[PDB]
């Protein structure tokens, strides 16, 4: 296997394997506890260099394993990484991406049929998916099913086969490399957790922020709300327990059957069609957590630095209690009929 493509086959399945954790003397005593990020990355180096750059900045997370997950193999990626020094760091590497696939499925065989061939025009061709198209009567893109294959194949591969997380007993955060992290988020989530243990038994995970930040932290640094996970204002530093993703890995036949090619959207649809329970989430009032790249940059770094004040509240306190109500969502978006995609998703669990 000598080609581009075979060679990064085998760097995927060889990392993969070996989980090289760099910046730990693994004859210490040390282990991960409490919190561990993942980091969905794919291929806007610019922006995973913002989220490195938070991480550096922030504060306590000398001890905080970060797990970067690649669908895209670059040196100038795997330097970024590689200039961390600061925390534990492991890179794992999904290995169906288009990257890896490009001219057969999961990537584009050209034996697939065109995205708006007609269904009977699509029989007569005898194209690959013809009998499988989306509910809107449209084949598949691979560009636009990577992420969903990603999120999920890269849930299950931390849960169950990162060997140092073997028996972890904290949460997992969910982030992506176009996120930029307050500096008091682990001060912030150690205490949410707490709150959480003590106040919110029926809450199944933990959000660092909506995407809505007031411009004073004023009267609002210090408390937390209960709410119904709604995916468009918690899938942005989403903290699962080992609880919330067994309940989620024991749904993979609903998840990768679900015609919906965002991962979120389907979260949504299986908090209310397949979990035993909907989900509540704990959420700060203001965002511990960013959407963003220089100015964008800047405008989150000059609202920090204005609220300086408010940042590593001494308690955080629930905001009052209300009736929350499950949340189904509006429509299916499609993109997700094809059958070879929902047969590869339900393959990771194995
Ligand atoms: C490398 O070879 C494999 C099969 O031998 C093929 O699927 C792939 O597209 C090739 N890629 C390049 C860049 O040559
Ligand atoms: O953005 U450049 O390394
Ligand atoms: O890929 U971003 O949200
Ligand atoms: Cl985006």
Request: proline share 5%; with cysteine.
């Amino acid at each position: 296997a000598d080609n581009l493509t075979l060679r990064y086959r085998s760097l995927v399945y060889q990392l993969n394997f070996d989980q090289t954790l760099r910046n730990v003397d693994k004859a210490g005593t040390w282990a991960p506890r409490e919190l561990v990020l993942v980091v969905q990355v794919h291929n806007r180096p610019e922006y995973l260099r913002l989220l490195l750059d938070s991480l550096r900045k922030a504060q306590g997370i000398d001890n905080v394993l970060v797990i970067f997950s690649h669908d895209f193999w670059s040196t100038e990626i795997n330097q970024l990484i590689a200039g961390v020094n600061f925390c534990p760091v492991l890179q794992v590497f999904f290995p169906f991406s288009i990257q890896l696939y490009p001219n057969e499925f999961p990537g584009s065989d050209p034996r697939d049929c065109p995205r708006d061939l007609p269904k009977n025009a699509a029989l007569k061709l005898g194209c690959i998916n013809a009998e499988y198209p989306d509910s809107f009567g449209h084949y598949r893109e691979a560009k636009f099913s990577q992420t969903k294959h990603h999120w999920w194949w890269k849930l299950h591969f931390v849960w169950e086969r990162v060997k140092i997380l073997r028996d972890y007993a904290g949460l997992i955060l969910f982030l992506e490399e176009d996120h930029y992290l307050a500096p008091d988020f682990y001060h912030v989530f150690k205490k949410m957790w707490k709150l959480k243990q003590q106040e919110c038994p029926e809450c199944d995970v933990l959000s660092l922020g909506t995407y809505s930040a007031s411009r004073s932290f004023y009267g609002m640094a210090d408390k937390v709300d209960v709410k119904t996970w709604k995916s468009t204002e918690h899938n942005m530093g989403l903290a699962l327990t080992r609880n919330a993703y067994q309940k989620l890995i024991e749904c993979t036949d609903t998840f990768c059957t679900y015609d919906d090619y965002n991962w979120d959207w389907t979260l949504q649809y299986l908090t209310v069609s397949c979990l035993p329970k909907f989900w509540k989430v704990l959420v700060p009032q203001i965002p511990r957590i960013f959407h963003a790249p220089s100015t964008q940059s800047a405008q989150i770094e000059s609202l920090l630095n204005n609220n300086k004040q408010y940042m590593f509240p001494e308690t955080l306190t629930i905001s009052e209690k209300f009736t929350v109500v499950a949340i189904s969502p509006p429509r299916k978006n499609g993109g997700w009929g094809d059958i070879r995609d929902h047969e590869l998703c339900k393959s990771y669990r194995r």
